[PDB]
Coordinates of C-alpha atoms and ligand atoms in Angstrom, one line a residue:
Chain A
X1 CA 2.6 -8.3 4.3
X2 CA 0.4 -7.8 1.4
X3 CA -2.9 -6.0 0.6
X4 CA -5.0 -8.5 -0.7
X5 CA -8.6 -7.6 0.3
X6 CA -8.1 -4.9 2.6
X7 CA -5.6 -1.3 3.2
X8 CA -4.2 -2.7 6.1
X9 CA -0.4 -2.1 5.7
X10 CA 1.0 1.1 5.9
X11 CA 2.2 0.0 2.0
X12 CA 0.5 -1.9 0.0
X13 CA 3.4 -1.1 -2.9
Chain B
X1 CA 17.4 30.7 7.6
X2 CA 19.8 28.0 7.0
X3 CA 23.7 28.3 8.0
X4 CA 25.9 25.9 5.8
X5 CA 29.2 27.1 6.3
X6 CA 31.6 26.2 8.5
X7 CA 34.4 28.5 9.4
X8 CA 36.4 27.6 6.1
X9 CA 33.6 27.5 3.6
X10 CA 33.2 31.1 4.4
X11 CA 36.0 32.0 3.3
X12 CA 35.3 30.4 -0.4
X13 CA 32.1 31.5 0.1
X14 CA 32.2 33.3 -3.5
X15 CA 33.6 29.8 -5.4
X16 CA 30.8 28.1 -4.0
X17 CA 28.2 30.2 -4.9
X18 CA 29.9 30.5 -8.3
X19 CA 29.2 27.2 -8.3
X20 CA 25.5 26.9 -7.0
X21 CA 24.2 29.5 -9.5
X22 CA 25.1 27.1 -12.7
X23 CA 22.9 24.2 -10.7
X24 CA 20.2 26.4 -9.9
X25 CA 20.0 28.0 -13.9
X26 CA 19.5 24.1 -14.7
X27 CA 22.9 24.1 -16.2
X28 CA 23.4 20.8 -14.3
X29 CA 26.2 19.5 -16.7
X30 CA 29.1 21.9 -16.0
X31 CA 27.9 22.7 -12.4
X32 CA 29.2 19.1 -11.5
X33 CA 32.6 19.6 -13.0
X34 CA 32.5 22.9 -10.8
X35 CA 32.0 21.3 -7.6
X36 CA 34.0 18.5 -8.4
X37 CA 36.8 20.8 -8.7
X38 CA 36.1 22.8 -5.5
X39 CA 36.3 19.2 -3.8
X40 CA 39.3 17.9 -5.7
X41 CA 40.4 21.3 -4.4
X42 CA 39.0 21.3 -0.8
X43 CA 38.2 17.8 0.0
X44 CA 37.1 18.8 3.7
X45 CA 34.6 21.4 2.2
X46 CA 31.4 19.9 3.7
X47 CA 29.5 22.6 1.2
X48 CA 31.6 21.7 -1.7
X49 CA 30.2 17.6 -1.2
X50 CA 27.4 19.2 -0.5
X51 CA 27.3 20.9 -3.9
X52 CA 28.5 17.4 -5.9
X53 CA 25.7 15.6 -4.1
X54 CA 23.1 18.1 -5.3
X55 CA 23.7 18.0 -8.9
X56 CA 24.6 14.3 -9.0
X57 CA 20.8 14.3 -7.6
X58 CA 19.3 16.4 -10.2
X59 CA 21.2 14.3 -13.6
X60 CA 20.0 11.5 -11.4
X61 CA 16.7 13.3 -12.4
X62 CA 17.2 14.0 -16.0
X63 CA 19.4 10.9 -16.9
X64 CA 16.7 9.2 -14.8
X65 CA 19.5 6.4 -13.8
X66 CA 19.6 4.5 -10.2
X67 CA 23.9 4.0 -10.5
X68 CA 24.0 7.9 -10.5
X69 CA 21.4 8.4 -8.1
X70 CA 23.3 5.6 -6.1
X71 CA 26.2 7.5 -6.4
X72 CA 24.4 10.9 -5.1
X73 CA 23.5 8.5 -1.8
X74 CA 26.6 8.2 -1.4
X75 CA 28.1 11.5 -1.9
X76 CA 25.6 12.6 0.8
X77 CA 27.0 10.5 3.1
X78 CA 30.0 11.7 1.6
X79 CA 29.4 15.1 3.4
X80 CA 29.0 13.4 7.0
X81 CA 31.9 12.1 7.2
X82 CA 34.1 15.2 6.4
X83 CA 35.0 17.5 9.6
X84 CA 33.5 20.0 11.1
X85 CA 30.2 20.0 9.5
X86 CA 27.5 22.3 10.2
X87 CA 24.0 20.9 12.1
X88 CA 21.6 22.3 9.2
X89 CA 24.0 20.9 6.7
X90 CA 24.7 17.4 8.4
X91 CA 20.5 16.8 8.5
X92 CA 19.5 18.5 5.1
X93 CA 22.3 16.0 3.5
X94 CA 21.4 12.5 5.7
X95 CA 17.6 13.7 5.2
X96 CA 17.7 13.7 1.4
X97 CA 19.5 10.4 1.3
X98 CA 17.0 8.7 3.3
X99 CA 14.6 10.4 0.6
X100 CA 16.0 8.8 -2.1
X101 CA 17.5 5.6 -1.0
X102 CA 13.1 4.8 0.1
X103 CA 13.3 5.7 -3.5
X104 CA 14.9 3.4 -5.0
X105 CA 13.8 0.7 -2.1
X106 CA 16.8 0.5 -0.1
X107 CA 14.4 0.9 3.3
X108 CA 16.9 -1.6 5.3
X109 CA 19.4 0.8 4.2
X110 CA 16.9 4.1 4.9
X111 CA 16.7 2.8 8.0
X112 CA 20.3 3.2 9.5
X113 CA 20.2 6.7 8.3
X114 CA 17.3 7.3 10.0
X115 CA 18.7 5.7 13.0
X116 CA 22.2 7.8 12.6
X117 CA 20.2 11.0 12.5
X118 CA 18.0 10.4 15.4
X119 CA 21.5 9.2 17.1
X120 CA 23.1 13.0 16.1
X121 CA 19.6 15.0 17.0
X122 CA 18.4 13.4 19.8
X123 CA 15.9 16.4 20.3
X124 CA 15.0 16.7 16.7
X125 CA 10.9 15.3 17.3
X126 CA 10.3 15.0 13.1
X127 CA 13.1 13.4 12.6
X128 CA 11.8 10.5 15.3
X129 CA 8.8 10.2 13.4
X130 CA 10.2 9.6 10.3
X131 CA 12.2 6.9 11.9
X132 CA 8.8 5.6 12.5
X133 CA 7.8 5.7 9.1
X134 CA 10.9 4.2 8.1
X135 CA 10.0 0.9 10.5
X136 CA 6.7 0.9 8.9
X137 CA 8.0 0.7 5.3
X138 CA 9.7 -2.6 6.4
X139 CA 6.9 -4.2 7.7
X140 CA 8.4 -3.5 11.7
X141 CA 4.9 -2.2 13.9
X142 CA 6.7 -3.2 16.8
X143 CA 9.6 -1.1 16.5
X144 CA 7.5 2.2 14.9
X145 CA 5.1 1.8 18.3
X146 CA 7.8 2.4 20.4
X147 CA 9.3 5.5 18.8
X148 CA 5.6 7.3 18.4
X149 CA 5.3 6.2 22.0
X150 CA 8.7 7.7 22.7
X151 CA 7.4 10.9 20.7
X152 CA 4.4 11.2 22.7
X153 CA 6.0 10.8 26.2
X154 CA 8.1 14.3 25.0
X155 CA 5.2 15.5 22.8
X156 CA 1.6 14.5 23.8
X157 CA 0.5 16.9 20.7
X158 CA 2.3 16.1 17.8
X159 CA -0.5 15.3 15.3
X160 CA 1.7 13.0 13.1
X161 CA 2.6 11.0 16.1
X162 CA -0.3 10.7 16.9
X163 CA -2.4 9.3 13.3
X164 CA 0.8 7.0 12.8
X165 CA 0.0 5.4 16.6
X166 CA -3.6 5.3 16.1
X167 CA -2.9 3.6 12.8
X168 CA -0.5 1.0 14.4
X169 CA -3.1 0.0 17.1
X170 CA -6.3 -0.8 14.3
X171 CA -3.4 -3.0 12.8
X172 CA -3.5 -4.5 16.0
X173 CA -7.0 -5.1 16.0
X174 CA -6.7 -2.2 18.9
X175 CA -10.2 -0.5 17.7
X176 CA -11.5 1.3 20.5
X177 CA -7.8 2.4 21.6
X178 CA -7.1 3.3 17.7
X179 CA -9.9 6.2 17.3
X180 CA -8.9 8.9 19.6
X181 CA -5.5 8.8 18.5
X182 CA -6.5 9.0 14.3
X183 CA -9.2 11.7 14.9
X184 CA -7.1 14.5 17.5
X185 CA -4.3 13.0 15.2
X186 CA -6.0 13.9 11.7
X187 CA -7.9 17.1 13.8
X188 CA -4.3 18.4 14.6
X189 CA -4.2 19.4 11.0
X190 CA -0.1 18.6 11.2
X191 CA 2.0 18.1 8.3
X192 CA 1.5 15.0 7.5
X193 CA -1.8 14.0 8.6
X194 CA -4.1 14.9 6.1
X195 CA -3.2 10.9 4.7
X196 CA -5.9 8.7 3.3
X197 CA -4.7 6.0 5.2
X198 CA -5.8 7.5 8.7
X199 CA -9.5 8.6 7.0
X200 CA -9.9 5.5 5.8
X201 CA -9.2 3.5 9.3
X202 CA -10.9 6.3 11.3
X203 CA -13.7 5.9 9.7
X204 CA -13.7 1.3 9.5
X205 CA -12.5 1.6 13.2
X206 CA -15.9 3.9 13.9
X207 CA -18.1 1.3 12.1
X208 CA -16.7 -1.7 13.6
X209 CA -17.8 0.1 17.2
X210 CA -21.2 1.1 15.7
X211 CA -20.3 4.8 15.9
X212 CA -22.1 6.5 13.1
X213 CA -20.3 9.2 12.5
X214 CA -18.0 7.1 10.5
X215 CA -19.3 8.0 7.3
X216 CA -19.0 11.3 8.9
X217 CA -14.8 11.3 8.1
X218 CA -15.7 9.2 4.8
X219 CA -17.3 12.2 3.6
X220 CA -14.5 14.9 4.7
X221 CA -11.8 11.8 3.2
X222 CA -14.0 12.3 0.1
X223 CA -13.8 16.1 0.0
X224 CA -10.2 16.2 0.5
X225 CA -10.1 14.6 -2.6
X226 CA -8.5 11.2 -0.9
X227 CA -11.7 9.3 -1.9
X228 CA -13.3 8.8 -5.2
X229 CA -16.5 8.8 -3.2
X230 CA -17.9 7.9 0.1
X231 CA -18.5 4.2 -1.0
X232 CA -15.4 4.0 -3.0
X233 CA -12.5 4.6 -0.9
X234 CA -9.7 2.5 -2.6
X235 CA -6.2 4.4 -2.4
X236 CA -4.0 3.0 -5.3
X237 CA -6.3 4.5 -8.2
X238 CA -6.1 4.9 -11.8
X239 CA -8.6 8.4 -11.9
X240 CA -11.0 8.5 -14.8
X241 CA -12.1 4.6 -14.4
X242 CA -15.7 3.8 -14.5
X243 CA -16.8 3.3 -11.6
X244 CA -19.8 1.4 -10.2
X245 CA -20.3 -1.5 -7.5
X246 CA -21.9 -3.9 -10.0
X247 CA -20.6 -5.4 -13.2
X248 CA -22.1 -7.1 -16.0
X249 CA -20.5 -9.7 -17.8
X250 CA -21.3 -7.7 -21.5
X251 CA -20.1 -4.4 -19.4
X252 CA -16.9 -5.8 -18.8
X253 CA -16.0 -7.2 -21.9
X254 CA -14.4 -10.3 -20.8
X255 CA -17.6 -12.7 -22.1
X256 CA -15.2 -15.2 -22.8
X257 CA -13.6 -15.8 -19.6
X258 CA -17.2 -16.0 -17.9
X259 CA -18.2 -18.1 -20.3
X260 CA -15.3 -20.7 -19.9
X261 CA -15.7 -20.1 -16.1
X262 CA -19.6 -21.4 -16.1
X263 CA -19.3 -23.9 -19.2
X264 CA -16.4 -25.9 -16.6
X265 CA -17.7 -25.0 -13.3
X266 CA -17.9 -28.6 -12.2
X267 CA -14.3 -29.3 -12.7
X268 CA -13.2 -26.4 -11.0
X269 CA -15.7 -26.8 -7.7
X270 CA -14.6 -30.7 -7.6
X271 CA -10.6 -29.7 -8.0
X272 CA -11.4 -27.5 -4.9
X273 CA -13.6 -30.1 -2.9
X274 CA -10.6 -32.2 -3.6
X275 CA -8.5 -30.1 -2.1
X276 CA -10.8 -29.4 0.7
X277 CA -10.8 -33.2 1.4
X278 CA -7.2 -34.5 1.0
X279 CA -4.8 -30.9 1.3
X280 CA -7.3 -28.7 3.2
X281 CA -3.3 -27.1 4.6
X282 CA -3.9 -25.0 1.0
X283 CA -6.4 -23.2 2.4
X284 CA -5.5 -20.3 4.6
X285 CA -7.5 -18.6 6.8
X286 CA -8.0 -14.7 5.9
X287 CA -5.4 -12.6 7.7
X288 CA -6.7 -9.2 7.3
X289 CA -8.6 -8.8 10.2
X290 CA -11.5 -8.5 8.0
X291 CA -13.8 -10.9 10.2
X292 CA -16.0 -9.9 12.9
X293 CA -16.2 -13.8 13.5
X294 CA -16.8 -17.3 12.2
X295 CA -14.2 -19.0 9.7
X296 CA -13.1 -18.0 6.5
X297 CA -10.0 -19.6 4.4
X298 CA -8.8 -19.1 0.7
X299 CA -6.5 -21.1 -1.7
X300 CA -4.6 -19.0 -3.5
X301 CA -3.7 -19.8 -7.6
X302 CA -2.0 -16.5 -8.7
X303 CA -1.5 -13.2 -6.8
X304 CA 0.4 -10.3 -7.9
X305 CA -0.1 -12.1 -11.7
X306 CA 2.3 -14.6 -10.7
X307 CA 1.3 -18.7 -10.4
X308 CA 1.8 -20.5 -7.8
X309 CA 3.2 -23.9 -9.0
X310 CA 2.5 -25.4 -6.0
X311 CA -0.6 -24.6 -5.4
X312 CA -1.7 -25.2 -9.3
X313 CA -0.8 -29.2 -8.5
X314 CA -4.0 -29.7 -6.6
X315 CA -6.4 -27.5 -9.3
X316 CA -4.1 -28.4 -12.2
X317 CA -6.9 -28.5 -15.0
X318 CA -8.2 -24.8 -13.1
X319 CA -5.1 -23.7 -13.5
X320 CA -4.6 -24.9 -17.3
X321 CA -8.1 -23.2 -18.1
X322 CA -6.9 -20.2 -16.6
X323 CA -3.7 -20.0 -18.7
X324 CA -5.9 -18.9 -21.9
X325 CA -7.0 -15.2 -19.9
X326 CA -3.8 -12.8 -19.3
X327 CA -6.7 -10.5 -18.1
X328 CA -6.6 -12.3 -15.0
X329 CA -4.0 -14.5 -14.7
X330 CA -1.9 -10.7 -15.5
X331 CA -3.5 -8.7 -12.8
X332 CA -1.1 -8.1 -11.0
X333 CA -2.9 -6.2 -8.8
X334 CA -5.9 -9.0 -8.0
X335 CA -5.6 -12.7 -7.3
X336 CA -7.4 -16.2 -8.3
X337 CA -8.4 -18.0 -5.4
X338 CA -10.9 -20.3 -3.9
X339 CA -12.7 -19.2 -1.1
X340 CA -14.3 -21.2 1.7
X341 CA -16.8 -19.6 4.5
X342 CA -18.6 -21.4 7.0
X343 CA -21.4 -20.4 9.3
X344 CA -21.4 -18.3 11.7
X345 CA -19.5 -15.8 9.7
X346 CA -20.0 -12.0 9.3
X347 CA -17.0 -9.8 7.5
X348 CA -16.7 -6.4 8.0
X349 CA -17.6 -3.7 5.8
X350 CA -14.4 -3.0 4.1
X351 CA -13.0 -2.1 0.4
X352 CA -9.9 -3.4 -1.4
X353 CA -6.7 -1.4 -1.9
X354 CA -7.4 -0.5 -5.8
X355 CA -9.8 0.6 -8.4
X356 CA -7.9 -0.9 -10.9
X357 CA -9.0 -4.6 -10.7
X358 CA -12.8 -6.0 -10.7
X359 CA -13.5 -9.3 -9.1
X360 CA -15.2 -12.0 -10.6
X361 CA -17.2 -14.7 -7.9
X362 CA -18.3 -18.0 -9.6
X363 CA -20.7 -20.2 -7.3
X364 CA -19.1 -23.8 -6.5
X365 CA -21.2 -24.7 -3.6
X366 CA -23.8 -22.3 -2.6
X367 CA -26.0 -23.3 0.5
X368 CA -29.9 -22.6 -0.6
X369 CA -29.9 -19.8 2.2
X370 CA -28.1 -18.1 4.6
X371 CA -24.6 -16.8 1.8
X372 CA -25.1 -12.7 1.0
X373 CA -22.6 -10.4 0.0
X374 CA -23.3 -5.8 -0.3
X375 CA -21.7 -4.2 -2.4
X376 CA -22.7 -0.3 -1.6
X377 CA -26.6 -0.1 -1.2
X378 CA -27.2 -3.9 -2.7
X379 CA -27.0 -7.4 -1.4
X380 CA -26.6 -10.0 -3.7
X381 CA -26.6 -13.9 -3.3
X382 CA -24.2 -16.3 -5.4
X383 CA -25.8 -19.2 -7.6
X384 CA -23.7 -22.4 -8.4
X385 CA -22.6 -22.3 -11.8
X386 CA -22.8 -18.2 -12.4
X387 CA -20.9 -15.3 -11.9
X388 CA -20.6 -12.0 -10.0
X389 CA -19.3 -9.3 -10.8
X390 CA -18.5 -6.2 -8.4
X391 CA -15.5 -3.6 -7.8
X392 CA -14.6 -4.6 -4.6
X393 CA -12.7 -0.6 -4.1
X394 CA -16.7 -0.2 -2.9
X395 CA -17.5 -1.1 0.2
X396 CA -18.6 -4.4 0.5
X397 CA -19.8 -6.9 3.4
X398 CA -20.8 -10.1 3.9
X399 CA -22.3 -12.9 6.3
X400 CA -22.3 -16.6 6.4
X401 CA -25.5 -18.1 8.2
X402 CA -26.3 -21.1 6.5
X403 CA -26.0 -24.6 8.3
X404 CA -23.0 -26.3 6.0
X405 CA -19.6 -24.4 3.9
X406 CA -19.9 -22.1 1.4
X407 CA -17.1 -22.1 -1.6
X408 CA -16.5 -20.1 -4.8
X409 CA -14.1 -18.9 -7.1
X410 CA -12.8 -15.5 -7.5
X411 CA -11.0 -14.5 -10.3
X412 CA -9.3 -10.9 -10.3
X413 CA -9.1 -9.2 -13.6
X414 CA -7.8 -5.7 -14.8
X415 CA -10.1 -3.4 -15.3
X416 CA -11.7 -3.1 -18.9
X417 CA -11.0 0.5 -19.5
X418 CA -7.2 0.1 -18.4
X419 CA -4.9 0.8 -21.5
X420 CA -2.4 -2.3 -22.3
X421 CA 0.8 0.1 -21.0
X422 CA -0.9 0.7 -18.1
X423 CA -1.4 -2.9 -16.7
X424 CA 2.4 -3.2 -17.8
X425 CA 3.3 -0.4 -15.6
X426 CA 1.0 -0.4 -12.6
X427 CA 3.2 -1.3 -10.0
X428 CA 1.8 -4.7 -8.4
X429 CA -0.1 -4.6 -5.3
Ligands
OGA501 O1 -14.8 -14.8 -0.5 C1 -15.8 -14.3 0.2 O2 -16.7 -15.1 0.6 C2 -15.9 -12.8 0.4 N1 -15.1 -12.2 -0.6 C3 -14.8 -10.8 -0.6 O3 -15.2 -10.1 0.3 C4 -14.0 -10.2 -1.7 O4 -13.9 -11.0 -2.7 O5 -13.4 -9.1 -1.7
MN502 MN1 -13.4 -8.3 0.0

């Protein structure tokens, strides 16, 4: 998964 | 505090540390050849692999090559396999080449270590949280809830156990469950918990349950220098970046790109209408869990500075317009997308992931009332033909209550005061 708009995975990297 | 040696390493106990003083003064070159002799000479000398594993780490670090460093992973596997290997020894070597094989990204590969060492210290708590950690690097909630839940059966108050459940169950849209276990979690003052992350989620999950004292652990995120500021609460920064909720176009520097955005806004609302009408499977509906309710979908040109061929075929003439601005169609940390909301929507207060992009909104079809959007302390409304300009790394929200859609474009660019090498660099998000 990616953050796109939001921090919602634990990585966004 | 550490034992190392097995019964036969004590009794080269003097080679070996021979050979660990040369590492340790930094003379990293001819300590190698030292332990590679001591295990060409004793190749069951755990502390000998040991030895080669360490310095094949550190001219990992000053040759700053992967195949070396590969080669250090391993050799520290290496050490595992030989016989009669001390506990202290047989963790310290599997722990480091977890380290450094999440390093270079091998996290399937981190993974089975992790696995292996929980397997060979079943009692060892730390080392079943970082197995957690090393499901959550690969995307695997499922798996990382069990083992935290496993933790907590054995150890109701490990702190880190607890932030990395509480952080698992707001990803599952868990709110109310998720507070108690990031706050005793980030309260616990473990190693480990004083993350960002679980300030950051506290602190959404508080507001989405109207608890104010939200801004409460915004403000102690902020102090412990995890936060620009209490508005601003974006984790992948650049530090030093001017930073305010709301741009002008002149302040930005990229005239031209607004300008070619409002001079053809026509073409690029009716490209999107026509996809609307005839491929409305491009737009997908927001998967963030950033809604409160209603319905909100996006279509997607670039992301991650990458094009989307696809996607381009049903805004092709968008798409070639966009081709003349690297500034956007080169963040790689932003997107260019259209963006459809419909009545009866409200978004949560939330903030992007990084300070290092500013998002542009140009107004396609804007409802005469009903469409807002905060940024910070200010609502805005969008105008058809003109565009917005705000960091979205501040806290924005927005609602939806007019009586037909709503649709504009966004366009991600890099921010102004970013040097060229640093948008080459900045690892895409
Ligand atoms: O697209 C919308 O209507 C709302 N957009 C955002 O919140 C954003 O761009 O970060
Ligand atoms: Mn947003």
């Amino acid at each position: 998964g990616k953050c796109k708009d939001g921090l919602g995975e634990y990585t966004c990297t | 505090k550490p034992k190392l040696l097995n019964k036969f390493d004590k009794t080269i106990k003097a080679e070996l540390d021979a050979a660990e003083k040369l590492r340790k003064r930094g003379k990293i070159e001819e300590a190698v050849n030292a332990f590679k002799e001591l295990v060409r000479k004793y190749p069951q000398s755990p502390r000998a692999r040991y030895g080669k594993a360490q310095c094949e780490d550190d001219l990992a670090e000053k040759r700053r090559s992967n195949e070396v460093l590969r080669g250090a992973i391993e050799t520290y596997q290496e050490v595992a396999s030989l016989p009669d290997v001390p506990a202290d020894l047989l963790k310290l070597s599997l722990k480091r080449r977890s380290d450094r094989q999440q390093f270079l990204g091998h996290m399937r590969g981190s993974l089975l270590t992790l696995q292996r060492l929980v397997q060979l210290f079943p009692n060892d708590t730390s080392l079943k949280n970082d197995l957690g950690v090393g499901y959550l690097l690969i995307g695997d909630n499922d798996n990382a809830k069990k083992v935290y839940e496993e933790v907590l059966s054995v150890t109701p108050n490990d702190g880190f156990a607890k932030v990395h459940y509480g952080f698992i169950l707001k990803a599952q849209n868990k709110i109310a469950e998720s507070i108690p276990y990031l706050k005793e979690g980030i309260e616990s003052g473990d190693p480990g918990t004083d993350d960002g992350r679980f300030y950051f989620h506290l602190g959404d999950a508080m507001q989405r349950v109207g608890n104010k004292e939200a801004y409460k652990w915004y403000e102690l995120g902020h102090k412990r220098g995890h936060f620009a500021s209490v508005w601003q609460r974006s984790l992948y920064n650049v530090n030093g970046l001017k930073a305010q909720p709301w741009w002008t176009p002149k302040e930005t520097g990229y005239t031209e790109l607004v300008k070619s955005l409002e001079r053809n806004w026509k073409l690029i609302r009716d490209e999107g209408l026509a996809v609307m009408d005839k491929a409305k499977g491009l737009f997908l509906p927001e998967d963030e869990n950033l809604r409160e309710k209603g319905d909100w979908s996006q279509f997607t040109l670039w992301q991650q500075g990458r094009r989307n061929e696809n996607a381009c075929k049903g805004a092709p003439k968008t798409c070639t317009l966009l081709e003349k601005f690297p500034e956007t169609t080169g963040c790689r940390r932003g997107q260019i997308k259209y963006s459809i909301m419909h009545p009866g929507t409200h978004v949560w207060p939330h903030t992007g992931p990084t300070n290092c992009r500013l998002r542009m909104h140009l107004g396609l079809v804007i409802p005469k009332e009903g469409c807002k959007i905060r940024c910070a302390n200010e609502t805005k409304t969008w105008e058809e033909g003109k565009v917005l300009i705000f960091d979205d790394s501040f806290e924005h929200e927005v609602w939806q209550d007019a009586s037909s859609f709503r649709l504009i474009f966004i366009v991600d660019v890099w921010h102004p005061e970013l040097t060229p090498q640093q948008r080459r660099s900045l690892p895409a998000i």
